[model samples]
Target: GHSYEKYNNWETIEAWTKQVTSENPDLISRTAIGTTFLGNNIYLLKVGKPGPNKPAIFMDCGFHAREWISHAFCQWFVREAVLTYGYESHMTEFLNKLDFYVLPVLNIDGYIYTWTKNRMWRKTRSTNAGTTCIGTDPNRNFDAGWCTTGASTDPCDETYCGSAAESEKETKALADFIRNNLSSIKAYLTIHSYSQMILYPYSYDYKLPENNAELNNLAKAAVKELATLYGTKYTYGPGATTIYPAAGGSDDWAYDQGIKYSFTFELRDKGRYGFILPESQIQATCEETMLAIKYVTNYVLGHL
Candidate 1:
């Protein structure tokens, strides 16, 4: 029932999410983790076979407000999950073996602000009383070596680390949720846009994890799977090398919390359209992304 139109406002996205959850109650349940600074609900959709003991895979998008394409993937992914659970044989197999927790938009306040005010806004809109600056980059506010590298301390900078780690309510809610679900989560993947890279920890520094080689191999396989669909290639490596050295990212925090297969996927278009990726490419992007996600899940199943 997805309309495939560009969502020009947060209201449309919220309406679509509600309809999807209402229609697919058996397989999907919506949970509001917390409220944004502007009092908008921060929703997380838990989709998979209803069970308690299954391994969990967590995926979230729109941590940066300007990355609208990232939000499309989460919406498409949820719809695919709902439809595939009943029809696709392979998806049914994967669902029977694992559970997925998907958050379509992590920075609700900022995302909404982008639609209303600035098109390129990239932080949570929480006011810092001392200065006129109004937001903190949620991606750089996690507890894993926070503000160590690839981040800025100035309040006006895009990569501001915030007053401290987990300073923003949105980041705190996500970190707390992941911490509470740490025992069953085998892998964690965060989706972003405009870079087309599959990166892993330690993004705060150059030190790779103990399972770095295995992680790299899995990322390469996922990239290959994505390539098979549309011939779109994605580079795979540590975040410091693949992209820039971003500190305190969700991938690094998840890895630091013992989820060995943590990854951050920068999806589609390599800056041609930047964050305003056209809606026409949604199907191809989601289709190719599905292959990569499934490939990673298959790898995690055997290793974990």
Candidate 2:
């Protein structure tokens, strides 16, 4: 699993994350946010000094479960942050100043279900309220315009918004953590795959974020940075206008929490490879994506 030779199981990824967080005295800290429905640990790999007042950026991946590239990039980002500090000037500076609250596997329940059962499982593995139907789109379970647009109530569907906001255990734990720590959290970044696009706020509707100009400008800059390595092209805009409609997205909810610079990136291969991205592309994918994140983090660092 540590080899990055290919995608790994939940156990391997969890153990590796824990090991990476165990630094000597002061590099970073592994915070166990909570457990998944299947009792798997949800660790928030915090990259920063020990302090309460540090500004933070909340980053999460594996939102829909099938996006292996998203998960791989999250794991890669953690390694890069911890191991490259001091040697990498920008990363070191970013870590020293702004805390990175990275949740590597946001949809662990669904990701696990993908391995043992369906390869395309895109939601949590929990039953919907009292129904026998299992799983709800964690992406669509947030409180931001919950179930209002581009969402379904039928538990059998992929875009099922749960009975209430944060209904899924994973969403509740993540949402609760972000809501409780709004002061330090400055930006929220979620990773997804296919249709290489960088989207920011107002996913539930077509309305532009108040800071739409700034957000779109940054997205343009970030995607250009991403293209430097492999010439990967990405479109950037509001979710409804850029891609499709989606209610209760984490990016929007985090922005609704008053954090600026919330974003969601649909990473590489565009559908030529789909979710089953080859292992060979992982390094290039992470390398380019890292540049965009650095751009965003550095931007977030000085804004306020």
Candidate 3:
């Protein structure tokens, strides 16, 4: 009963997760890897046929609340996978060979806060030490460059890196899950919004990933695939240069953890609508994003 084009609140998304898994038991299985600081279950849906020893691609959305399009894409991806498993030749083959671990919303607390209190909340909803600051930027709470540069140490700042690496429970939960499943996770793709970019690792620093050449080529191809739909253009490059030098970003941390195929996608609109992207654009946006994602999945499956 979930509409992939609509941006659902945390409650609706939570219900959809369970309903989708139950309705498509053969193609989808759900698990709670950990709980958020506010005690919301962090659901991770494994989308693929039940199989032994299948390689996986870890993809998470809603790292920062208010990016509803990012969250929508994850849900749309699940809908697409389940609805087209047999009808779509490429999707069927890809699902048969590789599993997609989709975390629809990482910052559940912030996402809910965005729906109720503030539509601009960008961090977790946990209380910080000594200050009245309410949360930590989960993206900036990783260990990659840990508050070094392009990140804030002030608890009140929007990009506060947190008291320590993996400080936020949400961030710790995600990192822990990835670490435990390190062997099978071949790629890490974190979805964000409002920049229309396809970026690869080293957002924490100026250094390029060891596979810079390959990463650059893949990113280029991804953007090309994305643009083939609706002619939506996208910029592609290393995160630091393409966007900014953001420390403690999940993509950077994932790459450093040996997931060489790690990439971060900044979806839709160059900035006119920004985080408040209209619901009307959801279908077209997701449709285009799916192309890039499938392209990456196909590449990963062949290499694996």
| Among all candidates shown, the one with the greatest lDDT | 3
Candidate 1 per-residue lDDT over residues 189-220, each given as its tens digit: 99998878999998999899999989888898
Query: Between prediction 2 and prediction 3, which has the larger TM-score?
Result: 3
Per-candidate clashes, comma-separated: 0, 0, 0
Model 3: lowest-lDDT 10 consecutive positions? 1-10
lDDT over C-alpha atoms for residue 209 of model 2: 88
What lDDT, from 0 to 1, does candidate 3 have?
0.93
Runs in model 3 deviating more than 4 A are: none
Q: What is candidate 2's TM-score against the reference?
A: 0.96
What's the TM-score of each model vs. the native? 0.97, 0.96, 0.99
lDDT of 1 at 77: 84
Error of 1 at 70 (Å): 0.5
- Which digits, one per residue and each the tens of the lDDT, describe model 3 over residues 85-175? 9999999998998899999999999999999999998988899889898889999999998999999989899999999999888899999
Please say which candidate is ahead in TM-score: 1 or 3: 3
Q: What are the Cα lDDT values of the candidates?
A: 0.88, 0.87, 0.93
The deviation in Å at residue 162 for candidate 3 is: 0.5
For 1-304, candidate 2 gives per-residue lDDT tens digits of 4755468788889888777766534866788888888888888888776665789899999988899999998888877877788898899888788888889898898998899999988989887656788888999999999999999989888999988998777889999999899988899999999789999988899898899999999999999998888888989999988898999999999988898889999998778889888989898888889999999999988787
Candidate 3's displacement at residue 150, Å, is 0.7
